[PDB]
Scaffold this active site. Structure first.
Site, PDB file in Angstrom:
ATOM      1  N   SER A   5     -12.386 -19.958  -6.090  1.00  0.00           N
ATOM      2  CA  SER A   5     -11.008 -19.952  -5.597  1.00  0.00           C
ATOM      3  C   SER A   5     -10.960 -20.327  -4.099  1.00  0.00           C
ATOM      4  O   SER A   5      -9.985 -20.869  -3.611  1.00  0.00           O
ATOM      5  CB  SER A   5     -10.337 -18.579  -5.655  1.00  0.00           C
ATOM      6  N   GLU A  14       0.759  -1.224   0.000  1.00  0.00           N
ATOM      7  CA  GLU A  14       0.000   0.000   0.000  1.00  0.00           C
ATOM      8  C   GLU A  14       0.796   1.283   0.000  1.00  0.00           C
ATOM      9  O   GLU A  14       0.236   2.292  -0.425  1.00  0.00           O
ATOM     10  CB  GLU A  14      -0.912   0.013   1.264  1.00  0.00           C
ATOM     11  N   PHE A  22      -8.450  -6.550   3.085  1.00  0.00           N
ATOM     12  CA  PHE A  22      -8.035  -5.198   3.363  1.00  0.00           C
ATOM     13  C   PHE A  22      -8.162  -4.424   2.097  1.00  0.00           C
ATOM     14  O   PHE A  22      -8.648  -3.322   2.156  1.00  0.00           O
ATOM     15  CB  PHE A  22      -6.558  -5.164   3.767  1.00  0.00           C
ATOM     16  N   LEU A  70      -9.124   3.919   3.053  1.00  0.00           N
ATOM     17  CA  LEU A  70     -10.243   4.399   2.240  1.00  0.00           C
ATOM     18  C   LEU A  70     -10.980   5.533   2.972  1.00  0.00           C
ATOM     19  O   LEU A  70     -11.460   5.390   4.098  1.00  0.00           O
ATOM     20  CB  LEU A  70     -11.209   3.224   1.879  1.00  0.00           C
ATOM     21  N   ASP A 109      -6.488   6.361  -5.206  1.00  0.00           N
ATOM     22  CA  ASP A 109      -5.747   5.132  -5.387  1.00  0.00           C
ATOM     23  C   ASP A 109      -6.010   4.837  -6.836  1.00  0.00           C
ATOM     24  O   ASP A 109      -6.642   5.652  -7.498  1.00  0.00           O
ATOM     25  CB  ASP A 109      -6.350   4.016  -4.523  1.00  0.00           C
ATOM     26  N   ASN A 148      -7.070 -19.759 -10.941  1.00  0.00           N
ATOM     27  CA  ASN A 148      -8.432 -19.272 -10.841  1.00  0.00           C
ATOM     28  C   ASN A 148      -8.412 -17.842 -10.341  1.00  0.00           C
ATOM     29  O   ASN A 148      -9.120 -16.949 -10.816  1.00  0.00           O
ATOM     30  CB  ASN A 148      -9.279 -20.173  -9.905  1.00  0.00           C
TER      31      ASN A 148
END
Length: 164
Positions: free
Chosen positions: A117, A11, A104, A32, A20, A132
């Protein structure tokens, strides 16, 4: 290596509000702020989260504080999630870190939707899941990051993050 170091790598750390890759406003360590167009809205949410008049800027400590609260919420989200919990409980410590990473980044809701998955990871079909997982908008929008997490689930080691 651990989840905080891992996410700090993926990040980065920005001390001023920023957009972002999907144009949404964030700050800190991938925190966020808001999903909307308003820088004002974003500045507004930032002050409420920090508890002071920031004027779009915060300290490192402030950023680390939001980070710790966010890691915490990701884990708790997984644990309260009916679709995620069993997967996480079935995985080893390194792979758990990769699932927390995804949560996250895209939310519980977005992760609980990787149905096939998830089944594969649960069955310990490492190579099958990795292929996948790569069939996704997630991989096509942020391929370098997606790759790191993917190898992580594949191999169960931190190899993808060494040298970073």
């Amino acid at each position: 290596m651990n989840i905080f170091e891992m996410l700090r790598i993926d990040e980065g750390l920005r001390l001023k509000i920023y957009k972002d890759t999907e144009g949404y406003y964030h700050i800190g360590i991938g925190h966020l702020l808001t999903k909307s167009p308003s820088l004002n809205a974003a500045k507004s949410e930032l002050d409420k989260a920090i508890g002071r008049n920031t004027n779009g800027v915060i300290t490192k400590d402030e950023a680390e504080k939001l980070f710790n609260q966010d890691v915490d919420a990701a884990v708790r989200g997984i644990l309260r999630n009916a679709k995620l919990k069993p997967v996480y409980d079935s995985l080893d410590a390194v792979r758990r870190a990769a699932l927390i990473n995804m949560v996250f980044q895209m939310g519980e809701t977005g992760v609980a939707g990787f149905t096939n998955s998830l089944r594969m990871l649960q069955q310990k079909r490492w190579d099958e899941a990795a292929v996948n997982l790569a069939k996704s908008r997630w991989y096509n929008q942020t391929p370098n990051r997606a790759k790191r997490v993917i190898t992580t689930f594949r191999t169960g080691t931190w190899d993808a993050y060494k040298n970073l």
